[PDB]
């Protein structure tokens, strides 16, 4: 649980994406929420101003305010404020979902995708199975740490990491019970970097290796942090006096959900 | 993720319990699983001997072996072994559920309950709401740390912890978003102790304060650890030579799930 020092704003995005085995994009979907936590009663009568760079009228985002939030003020001035102007935000450090958004992209469109994936597979010359290469490319401006690739098989023989055809990435098998099968973790994917993970694994036929799932999650704590899709906060202000600014912090996060090659 | 040095056995129990507001027990349900992680191929042709103190013919536990585990050997000798004797356990550190159990208990039966609960409520003399007392009694031999009580309300005013009628002057509101509402944490519940948490919270009527939920979790890493219900391991052995014992570790855990007063 991140600490709140009064007002803590969390901008949480989750990304789904599906790739054919050759790397062709099938689909993607990004879901976002803006959560407000307040733990100082003197700061509960507050309004959030979103960054000017956000088009709050972009229909492809389906921005939806919480029932108790004033939709018209959001749409007009990019302000998050209560629909009932006498009331105040709950101020016992509860995570308050105040705004949500969702956007989809179709086949062959990479606009929502932080990490592209392609696989190459061929029958192994050693194990009863396959020599896999997962190729990845990040378009993020920050590193991804502790990225986990899962293959849906449970082999009788150990997986053999082929370090000679992998990015030096501390690759190792890890226990990861959020996904079914055998999991390999890589230490880092550098900003804008392309790499590869290579290994040999037992499976009865090629198609049994799929879907391969990737799992990653990053977050940044910084008042000026911008989400993957550009969500950000311009200021926080008293509800009854918009010239009076209040102290706050912001966390942005991006997490994979159904992020796979099939 | 706990580290595995070869073989790691996890005995995980989850407890559901429901109480009337006056503390009368309505029901309870305990679920358990025994998970095996193996990350050294040399240890993969292994069999687990459960502790001699366990009764594997207690039908009220509905002991259920994984489809690949040999039910007759479990029942006959308390042995966890594969139903296909030519195979070995997957040895890429995957969590392998080998055995599960479940037991229920009815109204007024405390045999499965680690922590009994009772509540007392009255209108407050300060806030627009209620003076609450939650009384608890542990029957565990070890302390519970960081126990969280959740009340399903989101009050305008801050919660006021009544330290004069609480055991842990120390209790504090915390963010806990696994349960909906306002959450108060207590630092410790000592082994075998009875104590209380007292606070004042705003709500529109008494019945709005319910269900109150409690959240707790404890775990121990020790070869000789026993679970809540007494599950434990006697040894681990080569599948083909039961005199040849293998190195291993054991983690036991107990977690609340639907644990409430209503």
């Amino acid at each position: 649980v991140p600490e709140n020092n009064g007002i803590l704003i969390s901008i949480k995005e989750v990304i789904n994406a599906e790739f054919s085995r050759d790397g062709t994009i099938h689909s993607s979907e990004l879901k976002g929420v803006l959560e407000l936590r307040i733990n100082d009663h003197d700061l509960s009568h507050s309004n959030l101003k979103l960054a000017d760079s956000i088009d709050v009228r972009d229909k492809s985002f389906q921005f939806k305010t919480h029932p108790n939030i004033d939709k018209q003020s959001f749409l007009s001035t990019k302000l998050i404020s209560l629909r009932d102007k006498s009331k105040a935000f709950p101020a016992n450090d509860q995570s308050l979902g105040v705004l949500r958004w969702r956007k989809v992209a179709p086949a062959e469109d990479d606009s929502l995708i932080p990490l592209t994936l392609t696989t190459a597979v061929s029958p192994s010359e050693s194990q009863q199975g396959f020599d896999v290469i997962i190729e990845y490319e990040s378009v993020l401006e920050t590193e991804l740490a502790d990225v986990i690739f899962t293959i849906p098989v449970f082999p009788q023989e150990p997986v053999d990491i082929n370090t000679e055809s992998s990015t030096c990435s501390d690759a190792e098998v890890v226990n990861m019970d959020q996904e079914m099968g055998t999991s390999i973790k890589i230490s880092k994917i550098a900003a804008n970097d392309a790499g590869a993970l290579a290994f040999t694994i037992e499976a009865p036929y090629e198609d049994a290796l799929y879907p391969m799932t990737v799992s990653f999650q990053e977050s940044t704590r910084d008042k000026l942090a911008k989400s993957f899709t550009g969500m950000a906060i311009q200021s926080v202000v008293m509800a009854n006096d918009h010239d009076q600014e209040l102290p706050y912090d912001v966390i942005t996060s991006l997490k994979s959900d159904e992020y796979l090659v099939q | 993720v706990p580290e595995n040095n070869g073989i790691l056995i996890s005995i995980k129990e989850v407890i559901n319990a429901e109480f009337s507001r006056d503390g009368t027990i309505h029901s309870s349900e305990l679920k358990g699983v025994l998970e095996l992680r193996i990350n050294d191929h040399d240890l993969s042709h292994s069999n687990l001997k459960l502790a001699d103190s366990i009764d594997v013919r207690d039908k009220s536990f509905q002991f259920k072996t994984h489809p690949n585990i040999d039910k007759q050997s479990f029942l006959s000798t308390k042995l966890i072994s594969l139903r296909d004797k030519s195979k070995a356990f997957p040895a890429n550190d995957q969590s392998l559920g080998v055995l599960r159990w479940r037991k229920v208990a009815p109204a007024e039966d405390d045999s499965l309950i680690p922590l009994t609960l009772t509540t007392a409520v009255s209108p407050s003399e300060s806030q627009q709401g209620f003076d609450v007392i939650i009384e608890y009694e542990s029957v565990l031999e070890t302390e519970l740390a960081d126990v969280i009580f959740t009340i399903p309300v989101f009050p305008q005013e801050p919660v006021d912890i009544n330290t004069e009628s609480s055991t842990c002057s120390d209790a504090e509101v915390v963010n806990m978003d696994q349960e909906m509402g306002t959450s108060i944490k207590i630092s410790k519940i000592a082994a075998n102790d009875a104590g209380a948490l007292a606070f004042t919270i705003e709500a529109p009527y008494e019945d709005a304060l319910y269900p109150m939920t409690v959240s707790f979790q404890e775990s121990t890493r020790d070869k000789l650890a026993k679970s809540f219900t007494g599950m434990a391991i006697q040894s681990v052995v080569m599948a083909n030579d039961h005199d040849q014992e293998l190195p291993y570790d054991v983690i036991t855990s107990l977690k609340s799930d639907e644990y409430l007063v209503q």
Binding site: H66, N68, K87, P90, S95 | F154, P155
Partner: peptide, 6 residues
């Protein structure tokens, strides 16, 4: 976190 009310 979309059940909150007041």
């Amino acid at each position: 976190d979309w059940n909150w009310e007041v």
